[PDB]
Amino acid sequence: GTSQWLRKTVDSAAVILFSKTTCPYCKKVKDVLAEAKIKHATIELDQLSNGSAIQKCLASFSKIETVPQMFVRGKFIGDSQTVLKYYSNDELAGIVNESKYDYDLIVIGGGSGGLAAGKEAAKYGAKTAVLDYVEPTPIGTTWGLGGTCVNVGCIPKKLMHQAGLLSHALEDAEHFGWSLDRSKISHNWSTMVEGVQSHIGSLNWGYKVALRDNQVTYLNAKGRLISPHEVQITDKNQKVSTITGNKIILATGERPKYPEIPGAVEYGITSDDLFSLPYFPGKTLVIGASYVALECAGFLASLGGDVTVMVRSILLRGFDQQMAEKVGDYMENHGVKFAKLCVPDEIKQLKVVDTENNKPGLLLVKGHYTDGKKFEEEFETVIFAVGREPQLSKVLCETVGVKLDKNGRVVCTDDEQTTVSNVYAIGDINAGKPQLTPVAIQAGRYLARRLFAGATELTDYSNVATTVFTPLEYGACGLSEEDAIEKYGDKDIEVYHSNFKPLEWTVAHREDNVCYMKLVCRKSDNMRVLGLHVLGPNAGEITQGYAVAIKMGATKADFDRTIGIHPTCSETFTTLHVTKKSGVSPIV
Amino acid sequence: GTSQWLRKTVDSAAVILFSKTTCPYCKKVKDVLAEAKIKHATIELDQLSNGSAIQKCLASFSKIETVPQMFVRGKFIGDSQTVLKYYSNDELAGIVNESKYDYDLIVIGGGSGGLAAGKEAAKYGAKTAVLDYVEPTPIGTTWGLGGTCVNVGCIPKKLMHQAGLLSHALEDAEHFGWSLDRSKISHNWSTMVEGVQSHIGSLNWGYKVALRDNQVTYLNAKGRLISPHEVQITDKNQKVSTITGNKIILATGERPKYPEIPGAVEYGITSDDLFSLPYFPGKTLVIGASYVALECAGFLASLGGDVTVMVRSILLRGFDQQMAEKVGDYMENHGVKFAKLCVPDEIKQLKVVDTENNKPGLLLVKGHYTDGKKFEEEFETVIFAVGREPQLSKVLCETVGVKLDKNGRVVCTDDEQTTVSNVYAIGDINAGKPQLTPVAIQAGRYLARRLFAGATELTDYSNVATTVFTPLEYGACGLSEEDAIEKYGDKDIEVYHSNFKPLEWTVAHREDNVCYMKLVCRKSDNMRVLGLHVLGPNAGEITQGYAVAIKMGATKADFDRTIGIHPTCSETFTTLHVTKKSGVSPIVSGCCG
Ligand SMILES: Cc1cc2nc3c(=O)[nH]c(=O)nc-3n(C[C@H](O)[C@H](O)[C@H](O)COP(=O)(O)OP(=O)(O)OC[C@H]3O[C@@H](n4cnc5c(N)ncnc54)[C@H](O)[C@@H]3O)c2cc1C
Ligand SMILES: Cc1cc2nc3c(=O)[nH]c(=O)nc-3n(C[C@H](O)[C@H](O)[C@H](O)COP(=O)(O)OP(=O)(O)OC[C@H]3O[C@@H](n4cnc5c(N)ncnc54)[C@H](O)[C@@H]3O)c2cc1C
């Protein structure tokens, strides 16, 4: 067992040090490499029960069995004696840097997973190179280091969500005694975008510098994979180059799909454009039903905008449809108009964008309904939230032969390994993995540890909790009710559910029976909580804690035994009693 | 033992039916009892691991082994044919009403635990009586059914807390692009208390109906447990009677302590008085350092008040002390003055409460410091929050023999049983139990079930999560740091921790590195999470979910495995790596990277 583990580890590590805490020579060397500013991976043999047979199995690599044993890229370099010998002449900084390639690792793409990976690898020695190029949107939009989430994703999305939530905090303030007129108050999109952009702006820098502070060579270059070890980089002005790499990680992410219809690319905008947009979108049509679509439709509405969402079939496909229904309903009951069962045929420009005045154009959206009826309306802005796609034909020469799936995504074994043994893929592009930022970060960190630090641990992609950040938030962990029903059958699935009202809402004279949560369990299995769902404020803060207990395989009995914190939204989980089969109402 | 149980179920349950889920004549008997509006507990034997043992063992009460078998108050009343025979002759509703005592249960205290228990026992066919009487405070303040939490506790507490959060959310709006100065806006306290009371009003009524709906006899009366089964009662106009009850539930709650100093009861108020006070408190002094003390100081400050807090010794005794300091230092930095190491000596009236203008008085607070300096300041109102005492001397007639402890609290077994074998106490009074609402409700329900439903499960009192609702909230679950070391030794205790900033706080320009969270773990036992602590927004919402995993015995490995939800405050618990004994600083370096 250990024979194969050790065979892969030393071969792939850049700067590694086998050691004991119990061996004095081993700790003395750690002191030296520290004041020599050498980053190395430390395997501690006294803290492992696979280790009993390592010193004996290091005879095949260096013909010795004493600790410490420092390796550099598969080949041995020396123990306490040879390390100090190489130190007292400045020769250590020259020996560690010795490399078969330009870099131990090249990371193509500087987004959530990309950056996370490069930063970790560098910690254990790897001379790392992270490449990031942002390709302009049709209309011309670009941004700094950080990837999707930082620049055009979670960060702006949630700050804008926040601006939107505060719209109703202002309303509620009045009921709680605060003497302010909500009617007289308005929102300045422009002010808000400055705020948001300024934060993103400082995040771009944070990263840029973070890589510097980690001996990670950051290049603002478009990377192309020409051969299993060679990456072709293009700079800000066409100077083509070819750095070599030992390990390759593909972390290039996705971009927003445009529907294949006239006028779309020319007059329509994606989420890429929305977050840095100079002027308030105005009367807006969102075309799509992804969490991206409803999130954006949701915060534009809250900022006093005229918002329509065009929906071809169902909202939030993949998500639990009872909950998606309740999400959509909340939004409809609050001004988001829906064009149900409807597609766009074309987008025609009625009016151009006024820059000198900072105001949107007018656009005409021609489309049809399912029953063939026409659709025709004028919108100031058209936003296209119809899925995202990886564009790896910009990154991969087919002649390297990295296998892509039915829809253009890197097919990987469970170690994020591609069909090409030194090439790896993480994040949004790794087929079948949930497409979320902590998922990519985790995937990346755990991969760096396996490659350049001899770790075993794999990234667990199951029961990864999510939050859709709509006007009323939706938090989820585990299977949707319908999925749970297909897996272990209807008679096996019990659903304990309930409506609830945040105490903050009572005085504020908001809805009863609109906030809602449910637990989806499997009775044959002790009533195992397969799935947790909640619609209400701070849904993500609510959900996060249970994602742990679910990972650990919680049952309904666990939830019951746990005591509530009062007054909170989240507690209502701890005292759930009404099941769906009983037909009893879940209202208060 | 399996038999030991059965005896306990037949002798205690008001109305119980023994059953199988598959047996058609059980289904018929069930349906029949539902149509005749009869409430009963049920035990489905086909889903009890000791099933065939209990069934054969039933013969000692009924003489039969068949199902179903109906029992009322320990009297076996018949098989299917017998019970069907009773149903169409309509004699059934009278056979369940037959009882030796007036009620199967007298609950004394219509508060959190009392109501919770009341409603629960009632559902299984136990005849139930909830007693509630609200003793007015010194200045003469009273409220309706519900208890402390409903009228003068959690509900008004967090509602006022919410109003304090809105203050800072008005500042925040401006940065997020909204058109308001929030520098000229003021807060109208009169409007807020109308709203807060309006709600407590509807909860008063709500709970009253709830009891009636479950056929619980609600008496707005003072309850004296005069004998093991006798409860003497005084209604609205000193008219006395007596009612009997098989089993008694004490859930009388505590009331706020006062100091032994002149002027206190005369000129000062307690939290009971605060949440209905018609005038704005004005320059307020809060004497204490309990969560009530801090919370009330917190939102009063935020609501535009001049607030000083006099601490005898330490902030939040009982709570992890590192967390208590941070909690305090926040409040100080946000305009809450603290007279530290300080106790009051007396209070004197300088102006009388203008009760026709909605304006406070003026009070002289003479006090001395830990060393001598003699403290002496004026305050428009003064609020005492020095802990809360049980008034069992007002309820429990001495001659019964129910053991109280050092502090006047009912000593119970871990099945809530007092020294008098049929009397139980639950909630704030059950000594040495965490004094919280969801505790008092869990205790009540679980008790009611054990008795009248034949359940076995007790209330788990270990690792109960809390959240102090100060300006920046404090959520906590399990052992403090000074207790994890104190019990398992420094060498065993590994503390992971980290500062954080809400993404919401960035644009709004609030503090980086004031929010803090930590995980007190134990090396030997696989890094078992013994404690979780969090200072930051929505701390209640954050903590709750983890209190479930903590319960099941969570290890750091478990937090590590779990993916974060981005962007949330709570997610910082999943990537914690920095430890204390390794020396690395908690501070989040920058907008990271
Ligand atoms: C509007 C929106 C909101 C979202 N909200 C959330 C949320 O709230 N919570 C959550 O968990 N997730 C959210 N996500 C998803 C999240 O953004 C992704 O899961 C995350 O970006 C995955 O990171 P990645 O490294 O795989 O790809 P990316 O972050 O996109 O990184 C890829 C980077 O590589 C660059 N690149 C591409 N090709 C090359 C090449 N030729 N050479 C050099 N560089 C290249 C790209 O420009 C890009 O910057 C949201 C996504 C969107 C679109
Ligand atoms: C300011 C404040 C804030 C709080 N905030 C929280 C919080 O945020 N979260 C939390 O979990 N807990 C909180 N608590 C604690 C919570 O209020 C108590 O833990 C809970 O109310 C205990 O319920 P109980 O049934 O044991 O007592 P109570 O709810 O007080 O029930 C006692 C009731 O019985 C009545 N009574 C007394 N004697 C008799 C008698 N002789 N006959 C008939 N009736 C009688 C009393 O009038 C009273 O209404 C707070 C407490 C206070 C004071």
Side-chain angles (χ1 to χ4, degrees), chain A residues 158 178-179 188 541 544 565, chain B residues 177 182 186 544 565 567 569:
Chain A
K158 209 197 182 201
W178 296 95
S179 68
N188 190 328
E541 304 300 357
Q544 183 59 93
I565 313 163
Chain B
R182 178 59 180 180
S186 74
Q544 184 54 89
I565 307 175
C569 297

Side-chain angles (χ1 to χ4, degrees), chain A residues 242-298:
Chain A
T242 302
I243 57 158
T244 61
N246 173 24
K247 303 298 181 187
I248 309 302
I249 295 178
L250 305 171
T252 57
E254 288 182 330
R255 292 301 290 271
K257 271 191 287 175
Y258 270 83
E260 197 85 35
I261 54 155
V265 169
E266 310 85 296
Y267 313 114
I269 72 159
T270 31
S271 62
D272 285 354
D273 307 295
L274 178 66
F275 299 118
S276 68
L277 212 76
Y279 51 81
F280 183 67
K283 187 176 181 179
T284 294
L285 175 68
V286 168
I287 294 167
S290 49
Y291 71 100
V292 166
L294 293 176
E295 280 167 350
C296 294

